[PDB]
């Protein structure tokens, strides 16, 4: 119908704004728990399994420009990330690149499922000492890579660019449910909550009668 779990995720929304200066490049980490619209909808379920697909959108400040051959890259988990704009990590063969102009219609690229375990895990309870490859509740089976946007020129670009990343999900299967979050979380990677001021769930009224 439309209440099945495939349609419940299959809208694509903003994830992260990645902007560069000329350093000359702007890296970014894949983290789908960026905003709060999507973190509350994906800690609904414990174990997930899904193929992503991205879409980059470039807008120069003041809007629109003459073309340039900016590239998008991708790093699989377990590989070193770039450091400078001209280092030799931009010429390896394992990192798939995407060459796309400004004035062309936007770029789109899929990403398959990238974990050694047979599902993702948004809740881990243990220590990674003799685990998978302080430290409470952080597993290395969740990182998915980087992107490392770079403009292609020999020198002197001076564009002051800005990109966006839209993320769709596909073929998503869930597993065992969990109740929804109701305390507004503070840190990014922990379930913490300001326990000095615990908020309520229902707005109050006068008394128990007089509905």
């Amino acid at each position: 119908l439309e209440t099945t779990i495939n349609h419940f995720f299959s809208r694509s929304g903003l994830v992260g704004v990645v902007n560069l200066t000329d350093t000359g490049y702007a890296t970014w980490d894949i983290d789908i728990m960026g905003f709060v619209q999507l973190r509350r909808k994906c800690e609904m379920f414990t174990y997930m399994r899904f193929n992503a697909e991205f879409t980059f959108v470039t807008t120069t400040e003041n809007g629109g420009a003459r073309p340039y051959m900016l590239q998008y890259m991708y790093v699989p988990p377990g590989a070193p990330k770039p450091t400078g704009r001209d280092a030799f990590q931009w010429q390896t063969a394992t990192n798939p690149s995407v060459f796309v102009k400004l004035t062309d219609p936007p770029a789109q690229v899929s990403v398959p499922f990238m974990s050694p375990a047979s599902a993702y895990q948004w809740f881990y309870d243990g220590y990674p000492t003799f685990g998978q490859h302080t430290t409470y509740g952080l597993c290395p089976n969740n990182m998915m890579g980087t992107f490392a946007v770079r403009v292609v020129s020999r020198e002197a670009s001076q564009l002051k660019l800005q990109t966006r990343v839209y993320m769709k999900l596909k073929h998503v299967r869930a597993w065992v449910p969990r109740p929804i979050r109701s305390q507004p979380y503070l840190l990014k990677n922990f379930p913490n909550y300001d326990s000095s001021k615990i908020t309520n769930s229902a707005r109050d009224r006068s008394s128990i009668k007089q509905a």
């Binding site: 375990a117 309870d125 243990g126 409470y136 065992v176 769930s201």
Partner: protein
């Protein structure tokens, strides 16, 4: 009667011990007074350093077993109040600070054979409201009608074999929803005892 977890019989598809570890265990009987506030245990950590099963999970580093619980509180017909027995998979607790980043540490997150104590019950000490907390397999123990709960839990993990000291498969919680009330001239402490029995253990690895 009995209530399974998600409708699945515990079975198995490495060494395979038998009836010597099919014996029942018995943890310590707690004390639920007028103003107590809840306990939790985090299986299968509490069966370490104890008994025959302790000498097969301390020296092996692969593990798979589904459990079978029996929670039972003994009280006469002049006491009132209802408990709550739920079995939460992947039970993650978080530190109650605000800022840096004060973690729980170790002495709370792995209680061992003594169960710990909830600090704030209304939000399950994990940012989740108790009102929605019956999605999990639950079972009302209600001191006017029945006083026994029998949950059977199969092995719920993505990877088919994990270690048994680092990881923790699930947790068992006990919360007093209605506070206990009695007229004067009776006992104060209604005890709460637990019985745990492993069903299909299947170990692997050596030393």
């Amino acid at each position: 009667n009995i209530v399974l977890a998600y409708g699945e019989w515990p079975e198995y598809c490495p060494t395979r011990p038998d009836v010597s570890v099919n014996r029942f265990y018995t943890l310590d009987s707690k004390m639920w007074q007028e103003n107590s506030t809840g306990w939790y245990w985090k299986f299968p950590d509490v069966l370490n350093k104890t008994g025959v099963f302790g000498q097969n999970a301390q020296f092996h580093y692969l593990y798979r077993s589904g459990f079978c619980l029996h929670v039972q509180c003994n009280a006469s017909k002049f006491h009132q109040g209802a408990l709550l027995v739920a079995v939460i998979p992947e039970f993650v607790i978080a530190g109650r600070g605000s800022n840096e980043a004060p973690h729980p540490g170790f002495t709370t997150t792995f209680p061992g054979t003594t169960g710990a104590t909830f600090y704030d019950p209304y939000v399950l000490d994990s940012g989740v409201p108790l009102s929605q907390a019956l999605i999990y397999p639950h079972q009302w123990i209600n001191l006017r009608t029945n006083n026994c709960a029998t949950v059977i839990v199969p092995y719920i993990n993505a990877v088919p074999f994990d270690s048994a000291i680092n990881h923790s498969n699930f947790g068992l919680i006990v919360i007093p929803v209605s506070p206990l009330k009695y007229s004067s001239g009776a006992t104060t402490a209604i005890p709460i005892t637990i019985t745990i029995a492993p069903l299909n253990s299947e170990f692997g690895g050596l030393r």
